[PDB]
Design a protein around this ligand. Structure first.
Ligand code: ZN
Lengths: 195, 595
């Protein structure tokens, strides 16, 4: 009688960055989504497509949990159909997304005095990302037409930028641990039922 | 690859790296100003030099993109704030020469002391002990040596340094395609690339001079009333038709006439409304002052303070070994970190200061969505004009009756209102000829209208003619009397105090028409009015993204500064001033001197 380990995802001591998000494949278990919505600790709980009214009767195939940390002003960019540095260059959700976006303020966990620079976000890219596309490459981004030759100088920028997470920051500039549950309902055995 | 996109890509890298690094500069500066120790000075200077070297590296990178090839108006205002070269346009020897002069002038001023000629062992610095003489003493001879000794033992030392300061600051001005250093300082009000909102650097002279000619009827009746009352406090020392001596103006420089108010009170039997004792009986503390301060901004329509405001600000003196700069400063640290640092006491002055400093915060909270180079006021006088109208509405007896600091049966007295209006006019109308003449002298010195052998000749000829203030002792060309001011010896533009005063009552008269205030302007209170705070938030949320001529029209409906709102504020006093001065002479002649 195995159950789906949401404590490994939500209560993890180390979270990934948004440019390289940690997707976990959760299958062949029993899930309890009523405990997730009735926890009263999540600052953002927005389910798209599937209603958030405790649907514990639908059998899903895989529950992909994308774990990353962004700032509080960029949580609105994890909605389907948004624009910004996170929705275009870091983490893109499709316009036919069927899942939930859980995000809570983690200023007690991911902020240090002097700054917590362990979380990176991609500031520049040549084009926008596809939905559910991860780009971990760190090549030098040329703004125009002059070559960079592997070193960033005038008009050449390193595409990754570091979040500065401090506990004295405002609520908009504060680390939010975002867990994006993705549900794939297709012609499949649909192991994750969770009665 | 157009340069519009290459500068837009540059600013996205710049704005996030500047906001990350200036926040570390601001947090290190906060840790100094509340926790003064030997480690915090070094950590402020280390994290301040990283910001001061990053900003000069990317300023040279911003000049790669030509400003004439940028089409978007948002990018041009950020690039012009970043391509503005300063001392970097000079050579390596001259830039080191300029900062040697600026550091020497700032240390001669701060560590300079004037000695008493009667007792030579009493040599007093300006801020601890020499400002105490010029703001509290009522003796002619005691204020004479403190005034003369400050401009002889200190201002003479700044004269050979200010002459080379003029030549070096004119050299970097003409290397940045400016006429002089005064034209460089007038570029803070210069607005370009606008359709009808363009403001030239020559238009600032034509607006400050034109607005000042309308304060002359108000200032002359104030000058005549001060002179008629100073000739009672100082008998046989001021002629009834002449100018005022410079050491009898309630200040070291005659900047504010506020300290002369005990010598000139219109109704001595009617005391001013001072609610510092009603807070003690109601058991108010430092937190209650700021909670009542933010209730004023909630009632006007502005949002509440942040959650991190109350836990991170220093709203009281800590009562420990931590040395604290107790000057009231509202801190915009960046990344939505807003703080107020003041050693608040339970008084009425700190009650109005808490409204003034929180009005700085509500301005800082409004342009937080702007880009980092546009997170400031519309000009250098817009930011303190917003804070000053909050202290105007809070000090009214109508507001002090609603919050319980006055009895419900408090009947307003017109005799107490003339006492309030005269005390306001000694601070506000008394500083406008001083602020005009100090910048008028300094603009002509940089331009070349005033030669170096006519510096103190044209300094006192202008002060008699404009301010109506005569020097008590003759000063030759070895003196430097404007350099005795803080903003002159420390390289600051002083026209920020003139224009803020014009905007202060222009904003106040604009918001009190949407508040439906029936009565005179000085009795207005914009509290419990969500239309006078929504209108103010339209200008507040712009920041520096728009020209200040555009930002002025969004509240007051006029692009240029107007002093007729300022004359409407003191119009009940101006009627009383003309009746009081009917047996005196209004005006002054420049022929009379105390020597
Ligand atoms: Zn202020």
């Amino acid at each position: 009688t195995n159950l789906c380990p949401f404590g490994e995802v939500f209560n993890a001591t180390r979270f990934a960055s948004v440019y390289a998000w940690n997707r976990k494949r959760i299958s062949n278990c029993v899930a309890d989504y009523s405990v997730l919505y009735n926890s009263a600790s999540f600052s953002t709980f927005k389910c798209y497509g599937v209603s958030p009214t405790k649907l514990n009767d639908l059998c899903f195939t895989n529950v992909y949990a994308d774990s990353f940390v962004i700032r509080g002003d960029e949580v609105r960019q994890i909605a389907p159909g948004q624009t910004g540095k996170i929705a275009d260059y870091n983490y893109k959700l499709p316009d036919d997304f069927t899942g939930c976006v859980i995000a809570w303020n983690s200023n007690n966990l991911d902020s240090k005095v002097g700054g917590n620079y362990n979380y990176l976000y991609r500031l520049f890219r040549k084009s926008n990302l596809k939905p559910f596309e991860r780009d971990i490459s760190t090549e030098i981004y040329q703004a125009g037409s002059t070559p960079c030759n592997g070193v960033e100088g005038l008009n050449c920028y390193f595409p990754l930028q570091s979040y500065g997470f401090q506990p004295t920051n405002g609520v908009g500039y504060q680390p939010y641990r975002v867990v994006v549950l993705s549900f794939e309902l297709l012609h499949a055995p649909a192991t994750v039922c969770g009665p | 690859s157009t340069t519009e996109d290459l500068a837009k890509t540059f600013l996205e890298k710049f704005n996030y790296e500047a906001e990350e690094l200036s926040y570390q500069n601001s947090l290190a500066s906060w840790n100094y100003n509340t926790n003064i120790t030997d480690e915090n000075i070094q950590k402020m200077n280390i994290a301040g030099a990283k910001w001061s070297a990053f900003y000069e590296e990317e300023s040279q990178h911003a000049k790669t993109y030509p400003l004439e090839e940028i089409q978007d108006p948002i990018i041009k205002r950020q690039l012009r704030a970043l391509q503005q070269s300063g001392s970097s346009v000079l050579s390596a020897d001259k830039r080191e020469r300029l900062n040697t002069i600026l550091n020497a002038m700032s240390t001669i001023y701060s560590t300079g002391k004037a000695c008493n000629p009667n007792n030579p062992q009493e040599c007093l610095l300006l801020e601890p002990g020499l400002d105490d003489i010029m703001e509290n003493s009522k003796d002619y001879n005691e204020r004479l040596w403190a005034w003369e000794g400050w401009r002889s033992e200190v201002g003479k030392q700044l004269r050979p340094l200010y002459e080379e300061y003029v030549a070096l600051k004119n050299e970097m001005a003409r290397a940045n395609n400016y006429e002089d250093y005064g034209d460089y300082w007038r570029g803070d009000y210069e607005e370009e690339w606008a359709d009808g909102y363009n403001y030239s650097r020559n238009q600032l002279i034509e607006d400050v001079e034109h607005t000042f000619t309308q304060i002359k009827p108000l200032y002359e009746h104030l000058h005549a009333y001060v002179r008629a009352k100073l000739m009672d406090a100082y008998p046989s020392r001021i002629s009834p038709t002449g100018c005022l001596p410079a050491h009898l103006l309630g200040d070291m420089w005659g900047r504010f006439w506020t300290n002369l108010y005990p010598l000139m009170v219109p109704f001595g039997q009617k005391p001013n409304i001072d609610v510092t004792d009603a807070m003690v009986n109601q058991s108010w503390d430092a937190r209650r002052i700021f909670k009542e301060a933010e209730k004023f901004f909630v009632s006007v329509g502005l949002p509440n303070m942040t959650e991190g405001f109350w836990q991170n600000s220093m709203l009281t003196e800590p009562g420990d070994n931590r040395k604290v700069v107790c000057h009231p400063t509202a801190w915009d640290l960046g990344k939505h970190d807003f703080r107020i640092k003041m050693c608040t006491k339970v008084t009425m002055d700190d009650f109005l200061t808490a409204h003034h400093e929180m009005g700085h915060i509500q301005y800082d909270m409004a342009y937080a969505a702007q880009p980092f180079l546009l997170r400031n006021g519309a000009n250098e006088g817009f930011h303190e004009a917003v804070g000053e109208i909050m202290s105007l509405s809070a000090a009214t007896p109508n507001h002090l009756k609603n919050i319980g600091l006055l009895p419900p049966d408090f009947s307003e007295d017109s005799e107490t209102d003339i006492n309030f209006l005269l005390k306001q006019a000694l601070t506000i109308v008394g500083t406008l000829p001083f602020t005009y003449m100090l910048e008028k002298w300094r603009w002509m010195v940089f331009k070349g209208e005033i030669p170096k052998e006519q510096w103190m000749q044209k300094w006192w000829e202008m002060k008699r003619d404009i301010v109506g203030v005569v020097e008590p002792l003759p000063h030759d060309e070895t003196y430097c009397d404007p350099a005795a001011l803080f903003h002159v010896a420390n390289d600051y533009s002083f026209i920020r105090y003139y224009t803020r005063t014009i905007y202060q009552f222009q904003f106040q008269e604009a918001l009190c028409q949407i508040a439906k205030h029936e009565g005179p302007l000085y009795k207005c209170d914009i509290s419990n009015s969500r239309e006078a705070g929504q209108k103010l938030h339209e200008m507040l949320s712009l920041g520096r993204s728009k020209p200040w001529t555009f930002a002025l029209e969004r509240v007051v409906g006029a692009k240029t500064m107007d002093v007729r709102p300022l004359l409407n504020y003191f119009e009940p006093l101006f009627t009383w001033l003309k009746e009081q001065n009917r047996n005196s002479f209004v005006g002054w002649n420049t022929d009379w001197s105390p020597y």
